[model samples]
Target: AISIKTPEDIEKMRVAGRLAAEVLEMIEPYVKPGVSTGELDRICNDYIVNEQHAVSACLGYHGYPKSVCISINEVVCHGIPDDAKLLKDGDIVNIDVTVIKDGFHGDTSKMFIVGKPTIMGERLCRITQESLYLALRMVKPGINLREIGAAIQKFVEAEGFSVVREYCGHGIGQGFHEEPQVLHYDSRETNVVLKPGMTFTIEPMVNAGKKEIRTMKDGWTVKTKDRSLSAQYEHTIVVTDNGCEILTLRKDDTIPAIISHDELVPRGSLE
Candidate 1:
């Protein structure tokens, strides 16, 4: 498990996570139909290095050539960007970004609907993002980690959605992946007490089918084993004294939300 860090470590993480958030914000304008995933990767890498002066954590890691992971429809995760991988309307794409700034690493990701998506497709993506905020609200210094995944898994399944069990959320700081893998569903020895100064990410990958999955020939891209649709949303967060704060976005960054601020008291990364 990732032990709690000092205030200094948390501060460095804030810088890295903030940079990841900015890269996503900068790339948001270009996220639309007709854009190639490779092009999207370039936009993210350029903005991170040139505009923000941060290094991409994904580049060359485990032989991943791109600076980001752009998983399009049917590609559950780890979809490598290619020039020929053109995005069409009614498709959903997930942009996973990990930024390294001043030697600290912060990672966050979100899925986008290209132009328009099928009714079911859009709803699946929408709910997947919803589950993240719900989990975030439950974060506190003494909370149990199981509550985080339980809240997310229950909500997604209650909506007829399934959470990916193979790839759980993780602790991230100084490195790309860390200990204390945060499972989306409750299981054996799942409970871990949350503490202040701990940093991690809870990215729920929701699917429209049975929670089954399969790996691609590349040994990394994981798609629905049943060939159904899937979507995801992620955030790098710190467990706060009162609740939790998502560092991926600014102190004021507001993710798209279903129940507006008035409805959901104290909302963060709601979209």
Candidate 2:
């Protein structure tokens, strides 16, 4: 069953969410070429543990060795950070962060381009983010959960990218993952309805080629089968009476942290 957060729970979620976003922000400068993914993980882990007084949710979670999941190029998601895996020029990378504070969890990720950018690489990243934003605009009380996936599917497919089907978003709170699996594509199975105070994540992983993906022997890394570039963006959100609040919103985000029903705009209107 999906857990509906109370006022106290929401407050805790806000803290976890903010800390998670700050981890991503603090790691931006370190995402350039020649930096090892392991180094990035160490920096984020230290900041979360020392500065933020929080905990890294990914570390030791089901034996996930890294503090952060850093996926590069064709890697879709769950790319375990390693000292040997270094960032290179023209590589598109995704850094996924989930921090726990006061028992609540905040899950979010962002895509970063290395030294140089490729035309398709930048486009893939931008369109993946836009798809996430489109789904965010559809959040409101009484809306079907599938509508969120539908909005993402329509926008992403129109942009010529494919939505990853296996790995979807999920409800988040005191637990790392909860009920109501949030799919990136519309599905009849996800018929759940949204209610105020419900928290979850909307992370859309897009592939420049086919959506087919394969898992590495390491058991955590996921990559595109066609070896095509992939990009993803994520945000933790809580449904509200009007619309929803982006729990993991970053300072550099184009969308507002809090979105009201009145502020909800059409899909194409996003700039």
Candidate 3:
């Protein structure tokens, strides 16, 4: 059965979510070319644990070595941070953060382009984030969960992108991962009804090429098999009376305006 958070549980989630959002804000200026993913990881680890007085949920959870997941370019998810992996101009990376405060988990991720992105890269990242908010806009207290995936799939596929299937959003709170698995593609089978106390993530992995993926030899890193660009944005949300509350919404975050077929920026040459 899906776990319904109590009022006290919801309050704890708000605290954890704010800290996760703050970590993203603190790490933005550091996501530049020549910076190692390992260094970014260390900065976030210290901020979450020491400054925020919160626990890094991914650290030691199911043996995930790093405090955060730093995915670059075609790496779809579960990327292990390595000092050898240095950012360069025209590179794109995704930093995922999960924090536990007062025993509740808040999860979120965002994309960063090291320099000016190529036309295709910029469009992909913009649309991927847009698709996530598109799905999130459909959330409320009584709608069928399938609408979330359907909205994401329709918006992404029309833009010549595909949603990754292997990884999906999930319920989060007391445990690192909980019930009501959320898929980013359309499915007629997901019938769970959203309710006021339900809290979960709506993370969608949109690939510029095909959706098929492969695992690295290290067992944690996931990469697109076709080597195309992939972008993802995540937010932990709680179902509410009128709609939903974005628990992990950072002060810097803004709601994306609707994209039209003609509004896409033309492909430009990247240095």
Candidate 4:
């Protein structure tokens, strides 16, 4: 069963989520050729831990061994940060960040383009981001969770792309992972309906190739079988009375306005 957030719990999550978004924004300028993903990881680790006085939840969680997941190109998710893995021009990287504040957890991730990208690369990134927000716009109470995946599936497949099947978004808040596995494609498996106080993420990982994926030798990294480019975007949300509220609102204008925000939220990349 999924846990519902109380108003007090939601406030704590707002702090955690906003800080998570700031971690992404803080690392944006450093996402250039020659900088190591490990370097960016350290910067993020310090800010979340020291500056914000929050916990870097991903670090050492189940032996993760990193503060942030720096997934590049064909690497779909859980790409461990490594100094040897130096970024280059025309490379795409996905940086996933999560943090804990006051016993509540907030999670978010985004993509970055090092320099310019090929036409195909740009298209894949754009469609992937678009697909995520399209689903987000469908958020509200009494709606079926399947609509989230359905919207994403329709948009992605129509663009000649595929959604990653192995990794799906989950209920988040007070726990690292929760119930109601949020799939990115429409299917019978996800039939839960949205409700007030429900907190979860709707991250969608879209691949330029087939949906088939394989785990790396490290046992943590996930990559595409066809080695094609991949992109993802995520935001932690709370189901409000009318609609859902995005917890991890980015301080910048990088993401377009989908939900009317007297507020905002954040997510991804290409090259």
Best of the two (2, 3) by TM-score: 2
Could you tell me which residue pairs clash in candidate 1? Answer: 213-225, 255-271, 256-271
lDDT of 3 by residue, 137-166 (tens): 777777778888988999999999989988
Candidate 1 matches the true fold with a TM-score of 0.91
Identify the runs in model 1 with alpha carbons over 4 angstroms from their true place. Answer: 250-271
Better of 1 and 4 by TM-score: 4
Candidate 4: worst-modelled 10 consecutive residues by lDDT:
262-271
- lDDT per model vs. reference: 0.83, 0.93, 0.88, 0.86
- Runs of candidate 4 with Cα error greater than 4 angstroms are 252-271
Q: Considering lDDT, which of the candidate structures 1 and 4 is the better prediction for this target?
A: 4
Best of the candidates, lDDT: 2
| Residue 234 in candidate 3, Cα distance off native in Å | 0.3
Error of 3 at 237 (Å): 0.6
List where candidate 3 sits over 4 angstroms from the true fold. 256-271
Which of the predicted structures, 1 or 2, would earn the higher TM-score when compared with the native? 2
For residues 5-44, write the lDDT of model 2, one tens digit per residue: 9999999999999999999999999999999999999999
lDDT of 2 at 46: 98
